[PDB]
Design a protein around this nucleic acid. Structure first.
Lengths: 63, 200
RNA sequence: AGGGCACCACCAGGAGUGGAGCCUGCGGCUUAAUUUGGAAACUCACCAGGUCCACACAAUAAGAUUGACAGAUUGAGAGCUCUUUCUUGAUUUUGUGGGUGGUGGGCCGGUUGGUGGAGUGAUUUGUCUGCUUAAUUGCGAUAACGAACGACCUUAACCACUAAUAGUGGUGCUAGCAUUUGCUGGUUCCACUUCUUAGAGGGACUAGGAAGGAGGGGUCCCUUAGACGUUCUGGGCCGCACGCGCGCUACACUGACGGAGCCAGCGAGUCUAACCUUGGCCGAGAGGUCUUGGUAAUCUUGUGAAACUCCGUCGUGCUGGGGAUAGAGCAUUGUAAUUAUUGCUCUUCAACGAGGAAUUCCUAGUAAGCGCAAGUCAUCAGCUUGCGUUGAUUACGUCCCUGCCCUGUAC
């Protein structure tokens, strides 16, 4: 549950393109419940993405 | 007076069953004495508990109670699907194949009830001498059991099948292609994957 | 713009709600969970922790495997596990390869044409200048004439006919009072049908009169080993700084308390077994115990209900109004009442002195006051529906407010 709360503000999306948000933690095993634009079903998957800055590497002459 | 205990045994949904339910098969009057407890008023878990305890009178018990409960569950259930313990009792029953076919196989002859019965009857092996007898007796939507009995892969059996000449009926005949009257069958089909595959 | 209609609109008014305590629904908060949008187990869908359970290749067996006394192992346990060792027979076991499906995403709940007339057409007439209704409901007029959906059935109320498990009277016997031979009762037959009954038959058309009515849009793809599982113990759904709403009980004398009087209608009830319970006995009470009638117009039951009426105590003092919160004890249902189902007894004695802005229902046996039965249901109502008892004030109108409906321009 402590993880579920810590990320709560990040938005969610389905790979079918629907969007949603975390409401709250449920129980001790890290379940959570969420709300979406429309009727999901057990064939759907729910995802959220996190981003990190990449910086260029340096370069060297060659022979 | 044993029905005074049976009136409590209708709740035996878990744990050890009453001793009157364990010793009942030892009495030769049980075909009448079981009528005083009337397990058809009992919880479904006892039906499996009984189906493991009743294992030629098993055909009379299998037909007199097992087939009676199976019809009530499938016909009365709010989704039309048998309870897990009912299904487990049937698939765990039939440990003598003649008791299954003679008890329910022939007497069970809408379409939804036929489909559920097949989903159990295909779940376990059967003897070749037992399976051939069922295929002949079926040669007299009931073909959905014939399509199931044909899916498991004698000269009198081939002779009964040759006289057998919906999309489920065509596909069941198409499975029969997996093995002079054969000219008449081709003449019927000429009335095409079976006509080409029938050329093999 | 006009015009029409309605106590889910107003006017004249009634009862109020909004302010207090408590019950209850929703939102929010909290939490392991407080599931989702007449809950102590089960229900159950939620939480913590435990058991138990396809097809197609390679190895294996006459012993693959199946069933079972007595006892046992955990927080939660059992001949699917275990000590002991019988019974039984190919119904099948261990690895390795794609999954297929008792698997997800077929059936229902005021409105126009024909033929004729006009126009190159889109259009038009019929469907109208005038007069009527809730209405395409009608006179008349005349390039029109003749046609098609939507908008009969049961109550109230009088009377012949049924029948009796309902009622009345008489007769036999019999108690008390008084003694013209009366009056008030109890318990064997006979006559009747008016009251009751319930079923059937007939009884307003705009004509003074019972009455110039009330009601009938929904249900090909993906994924599969213990997989959209089975079952046990304990907890929660009842947690509460708060916001919104339906209610119950009160603020007293048109009253509270004590004794006495004393009257309904609609329901529902067991042999499947244990429902509705009279009568006797015990107990302060709640309650207990021995018998009994009823599958019911027959017995519970005249459901002897409450408000109400009469005679007393209290004397305007948060008082003898009001009874939240809380302590101790005695019972009943249930496997189990702790965070406490319900009932009884003694003690404790809170807010509340008629409620701002806002706001609901209502035109006669109606509003309001009062109580009873049924539903759910082991127990558990301040809830929902119905029934009866007592029984007013104020209109008999309008378009002011709210809301609905109808009858210049290519926009």
């Amino acid at each position: 549950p402590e993880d579920v709360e810590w990320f709560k503000s990040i938005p969610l999306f389905t790979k079918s393109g629907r969007s949603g948000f975390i409401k709250e933690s449920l129980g001790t095993h890290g379940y959570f419940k969420a709300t979406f634009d429309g009727k999901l079903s057990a064939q759907d998957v729910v995802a959220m993405s996190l981003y990190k800055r990449m910086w260029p590497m340096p370069s060297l002459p060659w022979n | 007076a044993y029905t005074t205990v049976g009136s409590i045994l209708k709740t035996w949904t878990h744990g050890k069953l009453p001793k009157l339910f364990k010793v009942i098969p030892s009495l030769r009057n049980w075909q009448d004495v079981i009528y005083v407890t009337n397990p058809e008023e009992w919880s479904p878990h006892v039906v499996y508990e009984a189906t493991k305890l009743f294992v030629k009178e098993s055909q009379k018990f299998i037909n007199l109670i097992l087939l009676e409960r199976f019809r009530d569950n499938i016909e009365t259930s709010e989704d039309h699907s048998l309870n897990y313990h009912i299904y487990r009792a049937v698939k765990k029953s039939l440990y003598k194949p003649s008791a299954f076919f003679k008890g329910f196989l022939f007497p069970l002859v809408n379409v939804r009830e036929a489909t559920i019965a097949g989903s159990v009857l295909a779940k376990v092996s059967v003897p070749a001498l037992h399976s051939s007898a069922a295929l002949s007796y079926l040669l007299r939507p009931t073909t959905v059991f014939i399509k199931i009995l044909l899916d498991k892969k004698p000269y009198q059996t081939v002779d009964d099948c040759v006289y057998y000449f919906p999309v489920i009926w065509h596909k069941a005949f198409l499975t029969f292609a997996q093995r002079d009257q054969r000219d008449f069958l081709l003449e019927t089909v000429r009335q095409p994957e079976i006509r080409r595959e029938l050329l093999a």
